[PDB]
Amino acid sequence: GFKQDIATLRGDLRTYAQDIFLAFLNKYPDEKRNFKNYVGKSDQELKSMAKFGDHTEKVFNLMMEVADRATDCVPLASDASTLVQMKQHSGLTTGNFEKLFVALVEYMRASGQSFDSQSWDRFGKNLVSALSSAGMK
Ligand code: HEM
Numbered sequence: 001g002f003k004q005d006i007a008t009l010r011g012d013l014r015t016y017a018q019d020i021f022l023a024f025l026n027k028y029p030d031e032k033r034n035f036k037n038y039v040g041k042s043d044q045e046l047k048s049m050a051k052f053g054d055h056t057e058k059v060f061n062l063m064m065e066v067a068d069r070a071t072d073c074v075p076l077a078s079d080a081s082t083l084v085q086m087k088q089h090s091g092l093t094t095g096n097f098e099k100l101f102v103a104l105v106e107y108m109r110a111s112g113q114s115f116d117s118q119s120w121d122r123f124g125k126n127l128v129s130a131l132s133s134a135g136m137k
């Protein structure tokens with residue numbers, strides 16, 4: 001289930017974080033508008049940049065904290081607020097997060113492993129509505 005998936009991801013967090021984020025960047029090319037330093041580089045080129053590995057892992061670490069604190073795939077309003085108020089998120093809308101989780105769910109369903117894809121789909125939608133309740137446009 002969802003709780004075990006958190007452990008699966010956390011066990012190899014750096015690799016999953018890179019692969020899932022790359023799946024998002026490749027599914028949604030216009031999304032590199034928020035990532036000017038990643039334009040014009042292949043997946044393998046990105047993985048060789050130190051800040052790519054570091055920043056994608058720190059993103060997914062916080063995502064796993066928010067996932068772990070969730071109740072029945074419903075994130076805490078306080079966690080959604082944190083993600084709204086982060087200065088690094090100043091330009092974002094909930095559409096950006098919706099696409100991130102569409103790509104993540106797609107990645108899980110295409111993987112070899114027994115992810116509870118439906119729960120992560122619900123988590124993404126519940127996070128989208130929580131970001132909106134916490135004031136994201
Ligand atoms: C639940 C999902 C997300 C979580 C937990 C999260 C968390 C974080 C964290 C912890 C950082 C700081 C990383 C660091 O610089 O060391 C960060 C930075 C950033 N995030 Fe998010 N984030 C999420 C979704 C998104 C999405 C969907 C976008 C855009 C589509 C985005 C855009 C950015 C940008 C532009 C930065 C600053 C530049 C960079 O670090 O590359 N984030 N995020």
Ligand SMILES: Oc1ccc(Cl)cc1
Pocket residue numbers: 021055056059100
């Ligand atoms: O540096 C990064 C990496 C992944 C994401 Cl979603 C946002 C910022």
